[PDB]
Design an enzyme around this catalytic site. Structure first.
Site, PDB file in Angstrom:
ATOM      1  N   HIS A  61     -53.430  62.349 -11.021  1.00  0.00           N
ATOM      2  CA  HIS A  61     -54.520  61.172 -11.578  1.00  0.00           C
ATOM      3  C   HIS A  61     -54.813  61.873 -12.932  1.00  0.00           C
ATOM      4  CE1 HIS A  61     -54.686  59.904  -7.370  1.00  0.00           C
ATOM      5  NE2 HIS A  61     -54.756  61.190  -7.126  1.00  0.00           N
ATOM      6  N   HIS A  91     -61.079  67.843 -17.295  1.00  0.00           N
ATOM      7  CA  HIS A  91     -59.986  66.952 -17.411  1.00  0.00           C
ATOM      8  C   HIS A  91     -60.263  65.721 -18.220  1.00  0.00           C
ATOM      9  CE1 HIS A  91     -62.832  65.247 -14.330  1.00  0.00           C
ATOM     10  NE2 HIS A  91     -62.544  64.139 -14.811  1.00  0.00           N
ATOM     11  N   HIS A  93     -59.459  61.334 -19.247  1.00  0.00           N
ATOM     12  CA  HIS A  93     -59.232  59.988 -18.871  1.00  0.00           C
ATOM     13  C   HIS A  93     -58.792  59.317 -20.242  1.00  0.00           C
ATOM     14  CE1 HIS A  93     -61.252  60.189 -14.971  1.00  0.00           C
ATOM     15  NE2 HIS A  93     -61.975  61.074 -15.548  1.00  0.00           N
ATOM     16  N   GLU A 103     -64.022  55.999 -19.952  1.00  0.00           N
ATOM     17  CA  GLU A 103     -64.782  55.512 -18.532  1.00  0.00           C
ATOM     18  C   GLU A 103     -66.139  54.994 -19.136  1.00  0.00           C
ATOM     19  OE1 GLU A 103     -64.064  58.466 -15.545  1.00  0.00           O
ATOM     20  OE2 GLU A 103     -62.549  56.998 -15.057  1.00  0.00           O
ATOM     21  N   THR A 195     -66.081  59.581 -10.818  1.00  0.00           N
ATOM     22  CA  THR A 195     -65.569  58.359 -10.985  1.00  0.00           C
ATOM     23  C   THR A 195     -64.155  57.989 -10.594  1.00  0.00           C
ATOM     24  OG1 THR A 195     -64.491  59.049 -13.065  1.00  0.00           O
ATOM     25  CG2 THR A 195     -66.622  58.438 -13.404  1.00  0.00           C
TER      26      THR A 195
END
Ligand SMILES: NS(=O)(=O)c1ccc(NC(=O)Nc2ccc(F)cc2)cc1
Ligand SMILES: [Zn+2]
Length: 257
Positions: A61, A91, A93, A103, A195
């Site tokens: 992911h 990490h 997104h 996000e 999240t």
């Protein structure tokens, strides 16, 4: 299981994790003219000089850089927090296009990506216990916009070819996460959640006002990662972001004026 596709994405998560519809879910839109300056908020204390990175890993992911959290080494303190939180991992997104990927949003603006430095409250002893507590985690969120390269990110970019598919990992020692920070530590803060599943409502969110700039070549290499594992139909790891969730009964506080 869960993911970011049309049949397993954020609109589906509540079926296995009903807290998805809870009272303090993340991310949220940061409405900058509704966030109130709170003069009682302390400056953040980011102490990463002793940080010990271990591995970089594609977990299907995102990709994650992991750190030794068995001692107070890289800790976050101050700001809205009481007590000491140890850096466990970071990490990102990101989007398929530069106009989406973050996000959190700022006055409904989406950034190209968002960095999460994940920390856990040492009074709970281990991260698994911390995720069961309303003050168990503190995640420092940093927006990425596309412009000039971020030199401190290049060592990460350099190795993504070696963790293309789910489950691949590599040694990633001696990485200094201070190279990912912007100049200012001004910040918004609110109580929220993870999240991604399990979406636990255990996070004090600290979102930095100042984005970092990354180059188009750097973010392009993010987009060449895969959600799938080796040998399986290639699905590019892009748009691994959860959209903004209802703010409900929460106030976002600003450390700046
Ligand atoms: N995207 S986010 O909100 O920054 C985030 C951070 C951490 C997790 N998950 C997590 O830390 N799970 C976990 C639970 C127990 C452990 F021992 C280790 C990890 C999910 C989302
Ligand atoms: Zn995250």
């Amino acid at each position: 299981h869960w993911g970011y596709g049309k049949h397993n994405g954020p609109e589906h998560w509540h079926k296995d994790f009903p807290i998805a519809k809870g009272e303090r879910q993340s991310p949220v839109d940061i409405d900058t003219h509704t966030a109130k300056y709170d003069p009682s908020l302390k400056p953040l204390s980011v102490s990463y000089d002793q940080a010990t990175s271990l591995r970089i890993l594609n977990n299907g992911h995102s990709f994650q850089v992991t750190f030794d959290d068995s001692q107070d080494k890289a800790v976050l303190k101050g700001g809205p927090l009481d007590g000491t939180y140890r850096l466990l991992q970071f990490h990102f997104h990101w989007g398929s296009l530069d106009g989406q990927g973050s996000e959190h949003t700022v006055d409904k603006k989406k950034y190209a990506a968002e960095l999460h430095l994940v920390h856990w409250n040492t009074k709970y002893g281990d991260v698994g216990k911390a995720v069961q507590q309303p003050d168990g985690l503190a995640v420092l969120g940093i927006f990425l916009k596309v412009g000039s390269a971020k030199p401190g990110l290049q060592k990460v970019v350099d190795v993504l070819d070696s963790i293309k598919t789910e489950g691949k990992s590599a040694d990633f020692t001696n990485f200094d996460p201070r190279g990912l920070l912007p100049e200012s530590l001004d910040y918004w803060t609110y109580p929220g959640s993870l999240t991604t599943p399990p979406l636990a409502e255990c996070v004090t969110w600290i979102v930095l006002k100042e984005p970092i700039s990354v180059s188009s070549e750097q973010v392009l290499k993010f987009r060449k990662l895969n959600f799938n594992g080796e040998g399986e139909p290639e699905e590019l790891m892009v748009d691994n972001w959860r959209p903004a969730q209802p703010l409900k009964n929460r106030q976002i506080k600003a450390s700046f004026k």
